[PDB]
């Protein structure tokens, strides 16, 4: 029976989840969960009341857990008491429990995972290879440095929030989220061939034009899917795409990605290390991100592909690149780039976002070009 299970096996115990996720989960008055305060090193009962989460420290003495009333030898017993009696958590607050909010299917225990070697560094910190102990599934593990500013750490679970919703052959699969203890991890499929930029540079002259077109076609299919889900990626670049053992491309690094039903994300203005040279002018100038700015990014990706991993605007700083683009400046046609592909790239970088092609158009055009290779 449930109440006899340890706290760490309870459906309504959410461990090290951050406050922003708590606020997401607590929807109706009386919705609650129990978690660990990483700072205070105490258990906390978080409950929605008058529209906002309220956080109550669970006291312990003589191995009995309590608030301002009776004590119990376990937190599940305390929770059962409060729920069954409908007693306010404190006389002063009047807060009453109504509904235990359970973990979703994506939560993974730390004990389910073994971390391997570092494979990358992202904006939040290191990315590791790893394995699931139950079956030896190889995984990629995204971590978050503790010293990052609170406002940025609050964005760490965005990649998981987004990828939980998706399933497509050209988008990296989420496996789980390790939020029951610190350190918190996001666990994804391991795409064994690594990043596409390194692939282009390493395999270089071995790659046939037909293969290059299939790989950017994969990217285009991934982007068409994301658009269909109202997802604006914002960080599309060759180095953020991964290559499988069979040279299938998958889009990765969703940390910046935003879901917007009406198709436009207005940036905070506070983003650091913005990928300027991959970003559309309206996105930088006015903070307007959309699938149309992702199309701009896609044009840069196409340039990266057909240059076999050249660095864009190599003789310009980020500020100089913005000034260059405002003057009409664009990247030159790579030697190996078919005329039709360059024409498409040029359309991706139309100054006005409304003049850029759709991802469906891009995918169909790339496919038609490949069929003559």
Compute the distance between CA of residue 235 and CA of residue 123 in angstroms, rounded to an integer: 12
The CATH 1.10.510.10 portion of the chain extends over: 195-373
Q: Confirm whether residue 114 is marked as ligand binding.
A: no
For 260, left (φ over 0), alpha (ψ -120 to 50), or beta?
beta
Q: Mapped to the 3 state alphabet, what secondary structure does 93-146 carry?
A: CCCCCCEECCCCCCECCHHHEEEEEEEEECCCCEEEEEEECCCCCEEEEECCCC
Classify 62 in phi/psi space as left (phi over 0), alpha (psi -120 to 50) or beta.
Answer: left
What element of type H or E holds 362? helix 359-370
Give the tokens for residue 185: 């991890």
Residue 254, marked binder: no
CA distance linking residue 312 with residue 337, whole number of Å: 15
127 assigned ligand-binding residue: yes
Is 318 known as a binding-site position?
Answer: no
Instruction: Resolution in Å, one decimal, please.
Output: 1.8
Kindly give, in sequence order, each residue whose CB lies less than 8 Å from that of residue 363, ignoring residues fewer than 6 positions away.
Answer: 217, 220, 221, 224
For 105-194, the fitting CATH number among 2.60.40.1180, 1.10.10.60, 3.40.50.300, 3.30.200.20 is 3.30.200.20
- CATH 3.30.505.10 residue spans of the chain: 1-93
Where does CATH 3.30.200.20 sit in the chain?
A: 105-194
Could you give the angle at which helices 359-370 and 291-306 cross, rounded to 10 degrees? 20
Give DSSP secondary structure letters for 226-260: HHHTTEE-S---GGGEEE-TT--EEE---TT-EE-
Closest by CA position to 97, among listed 45, 52, 21 = 45
123 is in an annotated binding site: yes
124 annotated ligand binder: yes
Write b or e for each residue in 131-145: b if 16 or more Cβ atoms lie within 10 A of its Cβ, otherwise e.
bbeeeeeebbbbbbe
Which residues is 121 bridged to in the sheet? 126
- Listed residue (327, 168, 165, 158) closest to 230, CA to CA: 165
Q: Give the single-character DSSP code of 274.
A: -
Single out the residue of 29, 39, 96 nearest to residue 67, CA to CA: 96
Q: What is the DSSP string of 178-242?
A: E-SSSSPEEEEE--TT-BHHHHHHHHGGG--HHHHHHHHHHHHHHHHHHHHTTEE-S---GGGEE
Structure letter (DSSP) for residue 13 = B
The CATH classification of domain 195-373, taken from the options 1.10.510.10, 1.10.3720.10, 2.60.40.1930, 2.40.50.140: 1.10.510.10
Residue with the two structure tokens 């009333």 = 69
Experimental technique, in short, is X-ray
Output the CA torsion 111→66→97→13 (10° steps).
Answer: 0
Residue 235 designated active-site:
yes
CATH number, span 1-93: 3.30.505.10
Q: Please identify which of the residues 195, 235, 253, 294 carries the catalytic annotation.
A: 235
Burial of 218 (0-12, 13-18, 19+ CB in 10 A): buried
């Amino acid at each position: 029976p449930e109440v006899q299970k340890p706290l760490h096996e309870q459906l309504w115990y959410h461990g090290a989840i951050p406050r922003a996720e708590v606020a997401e989960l607590l929807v109706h008055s009386g919705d609650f969960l129990v978690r660990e305060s990483q700072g205070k090193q105490e258990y906390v009962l978080s409950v929605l009341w008058d529209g906002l989460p309220r956080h109550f420290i669970i006291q312990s003495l003589d191995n009995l857990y309590r608030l301002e009333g009776e004590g119990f030898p376990s937190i599940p017993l305390l929770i059962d008491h409060l729920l069954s009696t409908q007693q306010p958590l404190t006389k002063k607050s009047g807060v009453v429990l109504h509904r235990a909010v359970p973990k979703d299917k994506w939560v993974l225990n730390h004990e389910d995972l073994v971390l391997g070697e570092q494979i990358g560094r992202g904006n939040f910190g290191e990315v590791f290879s790893g394995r699931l102990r139950a079956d030896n599934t190889l995984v990629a593990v995204k971590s978050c440095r503790e010293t990052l500013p609170p406002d940025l750490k609050a964005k760490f679970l965005q990649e998981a929030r987004i990828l939980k919703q998706y399933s497509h052959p050209n988008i990296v699969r989420l496996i789980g989220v390790c939020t029951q203890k610190q350190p918190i991890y996001i666990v994804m499929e391991l795409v064994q061939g690594g990043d596409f930029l390194t692939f282009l540079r390493t395999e270089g002259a071995r790659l046939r034009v037909k293969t290059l077109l299939q790989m950017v076609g994969d990217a285009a299919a991934g982007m068409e899917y994301l658009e269909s889900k109202c997802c604006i990626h914002r960080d599309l670049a060759a180095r953020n795409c991964l290559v499988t053992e069979k040279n299938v491309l998958k889009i990765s690094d969703f940390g910046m990605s935003r879901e917007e039903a009406d198709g436009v994300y207005a940036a905070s203005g506070g983003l650091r290390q913005v990928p300027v040279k991959w970003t559309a002018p309206e996105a930088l100038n006015y903070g307007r991100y959309s699938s149309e700015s992702d199309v701009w990014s896609f044009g840069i990706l196409l340039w990266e592909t057909f240059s076999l991993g050249a660095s864009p605007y190599p003789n310009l700083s980020n500020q100089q690149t913005r000034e260059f683009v405002e003057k009409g400046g664009r990247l030159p046609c790579p030697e190996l780039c078919p005329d039709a592909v360059f024409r498409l790239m040029e359309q991706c970088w139309a100054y006005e976002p409304g003049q850029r092609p759709s991802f469906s158009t891009i995918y169909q055009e790339l496919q038609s070009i490949r069929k003559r290779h």
